[PDB]
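User: As part of a screening pipeline, I want to sanity-check one entry by hand. Below is the sequence and the SMILES for calcium ion. Please return the complex as C-alpha cells so I can compare it with the automated output.
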Amino acid sequence: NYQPTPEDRFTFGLWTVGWQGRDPFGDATRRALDPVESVRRLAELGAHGVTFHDDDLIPFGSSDSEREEHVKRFRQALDDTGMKVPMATTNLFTHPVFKDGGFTANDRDVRRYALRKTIRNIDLAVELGAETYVAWGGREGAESGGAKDVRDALDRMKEAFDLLGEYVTSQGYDIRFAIEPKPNEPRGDILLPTVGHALAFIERLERPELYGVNPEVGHEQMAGLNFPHGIAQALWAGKLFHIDLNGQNGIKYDQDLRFGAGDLRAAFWLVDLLESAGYSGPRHFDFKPPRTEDFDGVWASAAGCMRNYLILKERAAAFRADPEVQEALRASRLDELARPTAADGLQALLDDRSAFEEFDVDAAAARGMAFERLDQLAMDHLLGAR
Amino acid sequence: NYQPTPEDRFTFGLWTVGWQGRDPFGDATRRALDPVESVRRLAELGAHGVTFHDDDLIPFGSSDSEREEHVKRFRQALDDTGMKVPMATTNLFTHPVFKDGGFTANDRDVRRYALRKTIRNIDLAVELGAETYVAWGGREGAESGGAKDVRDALDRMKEAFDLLGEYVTSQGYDIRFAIEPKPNEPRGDILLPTVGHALAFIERLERPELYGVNPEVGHEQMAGLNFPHGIAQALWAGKLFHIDLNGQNGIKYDQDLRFGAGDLRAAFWLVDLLESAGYSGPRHFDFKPPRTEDFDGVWASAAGCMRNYLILKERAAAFRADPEVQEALRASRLDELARPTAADGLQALLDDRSAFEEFDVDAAAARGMAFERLDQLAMDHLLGAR
Amino acid sequence: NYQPTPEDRFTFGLWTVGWQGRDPFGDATRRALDPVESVRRLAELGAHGVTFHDDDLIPFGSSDSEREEHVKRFRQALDDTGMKVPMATTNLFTHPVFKDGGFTANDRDVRRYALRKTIRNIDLAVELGAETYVAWGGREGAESGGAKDVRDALDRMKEAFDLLGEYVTSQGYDIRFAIEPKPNEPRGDILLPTVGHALAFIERLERPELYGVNPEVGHEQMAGLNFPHGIAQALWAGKLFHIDLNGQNGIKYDQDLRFGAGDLRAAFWLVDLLESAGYSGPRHFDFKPPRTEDFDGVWASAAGCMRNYLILKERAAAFRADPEVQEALRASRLDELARPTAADGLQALLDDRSAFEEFDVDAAAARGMAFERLDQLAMDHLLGAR
Amino acid sequence: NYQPTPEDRFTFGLWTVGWQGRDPFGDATRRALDPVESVRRLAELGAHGVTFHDDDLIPFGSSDSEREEHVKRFRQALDDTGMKVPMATTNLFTHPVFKDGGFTANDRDVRRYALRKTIRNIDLAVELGAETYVAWGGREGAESGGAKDVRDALDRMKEAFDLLGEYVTSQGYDIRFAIEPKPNEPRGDILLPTVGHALAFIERLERPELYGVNPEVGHEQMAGLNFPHGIAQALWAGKLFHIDLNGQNGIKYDQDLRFGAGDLRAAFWLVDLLESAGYSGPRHFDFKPPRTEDFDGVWASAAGCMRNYLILKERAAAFRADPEVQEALRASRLDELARPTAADGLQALLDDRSAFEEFDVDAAAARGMAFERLDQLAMDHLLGAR
Ligand SMILES: [Ca+2]
Ligand SMILES: [Ca+2]
Ligand SMILES: [Ca+2]
Ligand SMILES: [Ca+2]
Ligand SMILES: [Cl-]
Ligand SMILES: [Cl-]
Ligand SMILES: [Cl-]
Ligand SMILES: [Cl-]
Ligand SMILES: [Mg+2]
Ligand SMILES: [Mg+2]
Ligand SMILES: [Mg+2]
Ligand SMILES: [Mg+2]
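Assistant: Here is the complex for your manual check:
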C-alpha cells in the first residue's frame, strides 16, 4: 500500500539522509555517507531524485581533478538509477568565513567570495540538469541590534540576487532561483524571515520573474505561522517554484522531522492544497533522521516521508470527492467565497441599497457558518473513519 | 524631563484610553469615555492627536441626525485643543455579522456591506483631515483548514482594496491606505499575518502606490519576529505609511502594553531606526491601559507611552553621536556593509582573482566582528551607564 | 460508528456549549442557553455529565429564593436525563472585583470574599454529587514586575487552599480539589503556570492528599510543552484527579478548540496514555464552539469532541495490541526502560567493571534505537493505514 | 564604574568562554582554550570562580596519569588566581552513547554507565571544593511519542538521583544536587522541562533535602514563562541552590546570550528579587560568546555579563529605596498582599458578614490598583530617568 514511484517526484537532499547527527550538544552518531550510496538507496525506496549543496558533493577545498572525479562518480550513480537532480544550492553557512553572512556579510570581501562560490555552483547545477537554484540565507542576520543595518543589508542582498540574475541571463540558462525563508537559527533573527518577507523582497529585484520561494514546513511553523496559508499566498503570487517538506512540533529549534510528523493536520491541508492547485514541482524532503537512529533507521525515516505524503494525498482526494463534503462546502458558502464581491463595479455597489441602507445585518449575523461539521468531515476522512 | 509636546506627533486611538477593560474572561472595569473627554485629557498630556474607528466616534446604528451631532461635538473638542486626526479606520470585527470576516467573508452580502461601511467612513476621515486610512483584517482568516480557501480569500481581499483605491481616486482624495498585519487573534490564523505578507500582497494591487503598512510592535512579536527588522524592510520598500507603538511580552495573546513595556531593547532599536531614517509620520500608540487601572491609571499609562519614546530617543541619539560608538561601528565594519559589493560589475567580479582563487578565507574567518563590544556600548547608553 | 454512551464518562462544562461567542474583539454571536436545555441536548448526544461554575448555574446577585429555583430546575434536568455533575468550580475571574485576583488579590477584603464565594459553592457542589472541586486561578498574576511579590502571593495561595482543606475536613466532605494551571491570559503571567508548578505547590500544603491537578491540553500547549509528558508526570505523582480535553494550535491565545483539533498526534498519545494508565475519572471537555457557529454547530462540535476521543481510543488500542508494534517496542528497548537500573544496589554498581572500566561505549553508541520505525507504525495505526 | 570583584560571586563555566562556536550549521570559529588560560583571564576580569563538566577539564578517554596532570595544572591556576570552583556537573550529552539519554536511556547499560561517570566526577568536584553538583538531563526525552514511556523514565530518573544521594551520604560529603530544567533542545521535548516540574519531582526523592534547582534564564524563557516568577517559587520552596544567568530573545533555540541581553526588564526584576531575597549563592553565567567574536570579544562578553548584573543591582536598589516608590507600593497595596488573609481562622471568616453578606463588591471593584504608575517608576529607575 502507498508505495512511492519516481513519477511521484519525491526528492531528498544529500544532506538529509547523509546527516551525521552532530547537533549543538552532541557529536556525530553516524559515519559519513558516500553520495553514490545515498542515490542508490533512495532510488531503491522509490525516490525521483536528489538535491545538493556544492560542499555535499565536492568537499570544500578540493582540487579540480578531485572535483572532476566526485562529479563523475555522482553522474554514474544517477545514470545507474535513473535519478534526477532538480535543484541545487550553495553552502554559505558552514565555513567560519560566513560567520556574519555570505551575501550580506559586513566584510565586502566575504560578500564577493559568496557570489563567486554561488556562481561556480550554478554552472554545475545546470550541467546536472537542475531547474531551480535555492538560496537559504541562514547566516544573514544578527544577534544584536547594532550589528547589522537592515536597510543596508537588504541593499546588499538585492545587489547579490541582481548579479546572479545577470549571470544566468548572460549564460542563457533556464534555471530559476528560489529563496528559502527561515525566521531564526543559526542567527538570532534571520533576514527575510518568512514567505511574506521573501515574496515582498522579490518584487524589488531587477528581474522578479526569475525568483520565487522554496518555503519549508518547519520554518514557517517556527514563527507559529500557518504553513498552508503561506503556501496559498505563494501560489496566488505565482511564486511556488519548489517546496521543502518536513515536520516540526511548534515554536522551538528547527527539528526537521520526517514529513507527516509534527503537525499532522497541517500536513493534510498542505497536501490538499498542493494537489488541488496542481503543483507540478518536486516534493522535496528537507529532514533529519534523528541522531538516535542507525543507517536502517535513516532509510526507514526517508520511506516514511514518502508514505505519509501518499496516505495524505489519498485522504485529501477522498475528502474533496465526497458528495457529503461537497454539500458541506456549499453549506459553509465556500462557493460564494470564490465569486466576485462586486463584478457590477464600484458605482453599482454604491447605488445598491441592499448592500447598506437595506442590508439586514441581524439576519446575516444569525446564519451559522457550519464550519465545525465541515471540519469533522475533514477529520473523519484523514483518520479513515467515514 | 522628557515632556511631550504636540510637535512630537504622538497620537492615540480613541479605543485605547477608552478601553473599558472587557476581556475574554472578564467584564468591564471602567465606564465608557466620551470621545470629547479623551481629546481634552490627551491634549493636556502633550499629545498631537487622536485616531478612531467609525464605531468609536458614532455608535453603530445611529441616525443621520445623531451622527451629525457626534461629529460636531468631536470637531469642537479638536478645535478647543488644537488636536489633529491623522488616521482613521473601520470597525469590521465587533459586530456579529463580521464573525467570518468583512472583505473576505464567505457570504458575498457581508463583503459588500463591509465595503460600503468602509467607504462611508473614508468620507468622514477625509472631512476630519486624516492622511492615512488603516485596514486591520482581524476577522479575515480561519480556525479550521476547509473553512477558507486562501487563494479565493486573497482574490476577494485584492478586489476590496482595488475598489477602495478606485473610490479614493474617483473622489480626488489624497488619503492613502495602510494595512495593519496581525498573525492570529481573534481568528486562529489571520490572513496577511506579518509585515512581509502585507508588503507582498500590496504589489499585486492595481495601484500599489496608494497602499503601505501600519505595523504594530506587539503583532510582529506575537510571531516571534524582530520588529525593528520588519520596520527596516517596510522602510526599504518605501511603505512605512504609519506605525502602531505598544509593548508585548513574547508569543501569547495580544497584550497591547504601553510602549516601552514588553521588549525594552527592541523598543530602543526601533526608536533608533525611526529617528535615523527620518520617519515623519505619526507616533501612534495602540495600547490598552490594563483593566486593573482606574481613570487616573489610564492617563498615567498614556503619559508613560510618550515618556518612554522620548527617553529612548535621547539614548539612541547619544549612542549614534558617541565617538567611541562611531569607532566601534567601524571596527564592526558597518560602514563596509553600506558599500556596494560589486559596483565594478559582474564581469569584473568574475575576473577578480582576489574574490575566489586568491581569497584568503582563513584570514577572513579569523577577523572577529567585535559585535559584543558594540552591543555593550548600546546597553550602557540605553541604561545611562556611560 | 464511534457512538458515545454515558459509560464513556464524557462531561462538558455549562460554559462550553453555553459560550455566547464574546471575544476580546467581538460581541456575542449566540443567545444564552438555559442550563436545562444544555443538560437535555448533551444527554441526547451520549454525554455522561456536566460541570459548572457557581455563576453559570446561579446568576451573580441572585436572591436565595432565585438560587433555590435555579438549582431545583437544574436537578430536575439531571433527574430527567440521568446526567451527573462530577466536578464544579468557582468563578473568581469575571466580576471586576477580581481584576487583580481572588485568593491572591493584593486587597485583603477581596481575598476573604473569594474564599467565602468558593465555600458557598463547595456546599452546592457536594449537594449535586461532585467528587472534584476545580480551582482555576486565572486572575492570579501580573502584567508588570512590581505589582505582585510572588513569594507573598504564594503564601496567600497556600493560606487559601489550606483554609478550603480545613473547611472540607470540618464538614466531613469526600470532595477533593484539583488546580487547573494556565501560563498566561487573562493576566500577562499567571501563577502556577504549568502542571509542574502546581504539583510542586501542592507538596507545600498542610494536607497535600486532598489536592491534585486538572491539566488542560491547550494550557500546557500554550507554553509549548508536551501535554502527554505532563500528564505522565501527574500520573506518576498520583495526582491526576481530573482532566480538561480540548485542542490548541501552538503558542497563542487560548483557543479551546474541540478535542482532536489542534495537535492531533498529541491527542493520540494522550488517549494512549490515559487508557493504558487506566485513568478512571471524567473525560471532561473545556472547549469553545467557535463563534462562527449557530446552535446546530454547537451540538456538532460537542459530538465531535466525543467522536474524536473514541476514534483515537480505538487506534491507540490497535497500536498497543499489534504484535509487530510489540516487536518494535522490544527493538527500541522500551521493556529495558521499565527495568531497574541498579536493583543490585549502589555497592554492586560501584564494583561492576561492566558499568565503567570494561563498558564498550562504542558498541553501545552504534546500536540504533529504531524509534523511526516504531513511530511510523504509530502513524500507520492512527491513520488506519496498516 | 560597575567594576566586579570576587566578593560579587560571579562565576563562569569553562564551556562558556571556551565555546569554540560550533553550531548545528557551522564549524568552530575559535580554537580551544586551555582551562588554565580561562581561569587566568576570568580572574583578571573580577570573577570569583569557574565551574566545569568532567569532560571540559579532563578530555574524554584520558588515562589516570593524564587525568592527574590536567587536574594538577588546573589547581595551580586556581591557587595562582584565588579562583574557586563552587559547582560542577557531568557531561551526559555529547558522546554518542548518550544519544537516547544518560539516567533515562532505554538501554540499561547506558544508565549504569551514566551513574558511574557521575559518581567519579562527584569525587573530583568535592576535592576541588564544590558545594553544588548540577544535573542537566539534556538527552533525557524524546522526539516521538512511543519512544519513551515517561512514567518508566521518571522511575529511572528517581532511581538515579536516589543512588547519587546514597553515594554522597555514604561518603559523608556536604555537596548538594541541583537539577537544571530545560524544556526542549537537543531532544524534541526534555523531561522535567521547567522549574515547576523539577521541584515536583524532587518531592518524590528519598532524601528531598539534598536536591534543589539551578534554573537558567533562557530555559524558562524558551517555554515563554516568567523567569522571576519561577525563581520566586523556587525561593518560596527553599530550593534555589544555584542559578544560571544569561539572555534569550523569546521562544526559539537556546541562545545563551550574555546576561542582560535578551529580556532586559526581566533581568531587572530577577536581580531585584535575588537581592531582596538575600540569595547568597554563586551568580553563575551560562552564556555563549557569539561565534562572530574572536578572543577579545569573548572577554568583552564575559565582562559585560558582570557589568550588566551590577548596573541592574544599583537600579533595583535605588527603586526599592526611593520614598516615592515606597508610597506607590502602598498605593498598590503590596503591603496588604503580605498580610494574612485570615489569621482570625476559618470560623471567624465564615461568621464575618463583611467578607460576604455585607461586602461592597462595587466599591472594591472601583478601586484602581495603580500598577501603571508603579511600573513607570520602575522603568524610570532602570533607565536612570528619575
Ligand atoms: Ca529546517
Ligand atoms: Ca495589538
Ligand atoms: Ca483553555
Ligand atoms: Ca541554555
Ligand atoms: Cl520589501
Ligand atoms: Cl503575494
Ligand atoms: Cl513549590
Ligand atoms: Cl512529580
Ligand atoms: Mg529546507
Ligand atoms: Mg494596532
Ligand atoms: Mg479548562
Ligand atoms: Mg545552564
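Points to compare against the pipeline: The longest helix of chain C spans residues 295-321. The pocket of calcium ion (ligand 1) is lined by residues A 216, 218-219, 254, 256, 286 (CB under 6 Å).
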